[PDB]
Amino acid sequence: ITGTSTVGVGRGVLGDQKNINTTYSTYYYLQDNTRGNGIFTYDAKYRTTLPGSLWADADNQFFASYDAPAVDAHYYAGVTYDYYKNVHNRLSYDGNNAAIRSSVHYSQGYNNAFWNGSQMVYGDGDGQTFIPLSGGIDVVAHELTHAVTDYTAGLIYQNESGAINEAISDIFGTLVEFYANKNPDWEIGEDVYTPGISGDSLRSMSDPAKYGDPDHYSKRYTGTQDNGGVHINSGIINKAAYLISQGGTHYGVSVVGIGRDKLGKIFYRALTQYLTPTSNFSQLRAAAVQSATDLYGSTSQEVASVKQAFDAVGVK
Numbered sequence: 001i002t003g004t005s006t007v008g009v010g011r012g013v014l015g016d017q018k019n020i021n022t023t024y025s026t027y028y029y030l031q032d033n034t035r036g037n038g039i040f041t042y043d044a045k046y047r048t049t050l051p052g053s054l055w056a057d058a059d060n061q062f063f064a065s066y067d068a069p070a071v072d073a074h075y076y077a078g079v080t081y082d083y084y085k086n087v088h089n090r091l092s093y094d095g096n097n098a099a100i101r102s103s104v105h106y107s108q109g110y111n112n113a114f115w116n117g118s119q120m121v122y123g124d125g126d127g128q129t130f131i132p133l134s135g136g137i138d139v140v141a142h143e144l145t146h147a148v149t150d151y152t153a154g155l156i157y158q159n160e161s162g163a164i165n166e167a168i169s170d171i172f173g174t175l176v177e178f179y180a181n182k183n184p185d186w187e188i189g190e191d192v193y194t195p196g197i198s199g200d201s202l203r204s205m206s207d208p209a210k211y212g213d214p215d216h217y218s219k220r221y222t223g224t225q226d227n228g229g230v231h232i233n234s235g236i237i238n239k240a241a242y243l244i245s246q247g248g249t250h251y252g253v254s255v256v257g258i259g260r261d262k263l264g265k266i267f268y269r270a271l272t273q274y275l276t277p278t279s280n281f282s283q284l285r286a287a288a289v290q291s292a293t294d295l296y297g298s299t300s301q302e303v304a305s306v307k308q309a310f311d312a313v314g315v316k
């Protein structure tokens with residue numbers, strides 16, 4: 001909507017206070033004009049029609065429980081925009097400052113979130129398995145990273161290319177979590193998963209096997225569940241990315257860590273310059289090796305560590 005840029009204040013899903021960029025025209029809308037062509041947050045009002053209504057508020061204060069998922073979807077979309085712009089020189093998900101749209105309160109008791117090809121969508125959870133999923137910055141950044149992937153490599157969402165697609169979203173969801181630097185970790189969704197249980201998460205990058213996901217190519221899932229296991233076999237690539245950043249010895253193979261920033265540079269370059277819609281794990285290894293070679297040189301430690309990491313998870 002056309003109006004003047006304002007700054008509201010509210011509380012997110014975890015009860016933290018934060019300022020949000022809004023737009024005033026009769027009401028205060030969750031419309032941030034400070035980032036590209038805008039960040040827009042919508043109310044789906046417990047239904048499944050999308051996007052729903054641009055979020056309107058009478059007084060620019062967002063402290064109601066009903067407000068919290070909107071506050072966080074809006075705010076963490078901003079953080080994710082800032083990450084891609086400041087760290088990778090990328091302007092929104094299409095690289096040309098496309099408007100970022102999110103809907104919250106999708107359906108009833110909906111234990112998931114997704115990118116639907118056009119926008120981010122967040123359930124409220126059922127209060128047992130999940131609380132509202134926009135409360136997790138790694139979740140928000142995971143979903144928006146699907147938009148980035150769709151505009152760049154375009155990895156098909158099935159089998160190995162789908163597992164790479166998923167891992168890219170977990171990798172950059174995690175790097176955005178570290179960028180924001182509030183209790184960051186290498187786990188996925190811990191802030192919104194199972195409020196009755198402390199210390200768990202939906203997936204682990206540091207130890208995918210903790211939640212039954214493979215950490216080696218030899219344990220890859222080859223059935224048809226989950227689009228050929230895209231959220232399962234992602235553990236193999238997530239482990240490799242973890243090893244590249246943090247180092248470690250895995251099934252006897254030692255990897256020298258090169259840190260998060262270099263992990264991010266290598267995988268961002270692979271994603272945007274080398275991966276294609278049909279890339280498999282072997283081709284991801286080649287893309288990462290070539291990316292690391294471009295950035296640091298063929299005889300660099302960075303290239304050596306990429307190779308060790310993929311060796312360690314059985315991807316040749």
Ligand SMILES: N[C@@H](CCCC[NH3+])C(=O)O
Binds near residue numbers: 111113202
């Ligand atoms: N996002 C993943 C994990 C489940 C989250 C909610 N059931 C999926 O759709 O498979």
Ligand SMILES: [Ca+2]
Binds near residue numbers: 062063
């Ligand atoms: Ca209000």
Ligand SMILES: [Ca+2]
Binds near residue numbers: 183184
């Ligand atoms: Ca965390």
Ligand SMILES: [Ca+2]
Binds near residue numbers: 189190
């Ligand atoms: Ca996390």
Ligand SMILES: [Ca+2]
Binds near residue numbers: 195197198199200201
């Ligand atoms: Ca939990």
Ligand SMILES: [Kr]
Binds near residue numbers: 035037038092097098
């Ligand atoms: Kr934007």
Ligand SMILES: [Kr]
Binds near residue numbers: 080081091092093
């Ligand atoms: Kr983005």
Ligand SMILES: [Zn+2]
Binds near residue numbers: 113114
């Ligand atoms: Zn997903």
Ligand SMILES: [Zn+2]
Binds near residue numbers: 142143146166169
């Ligand atoms: Zn995903």
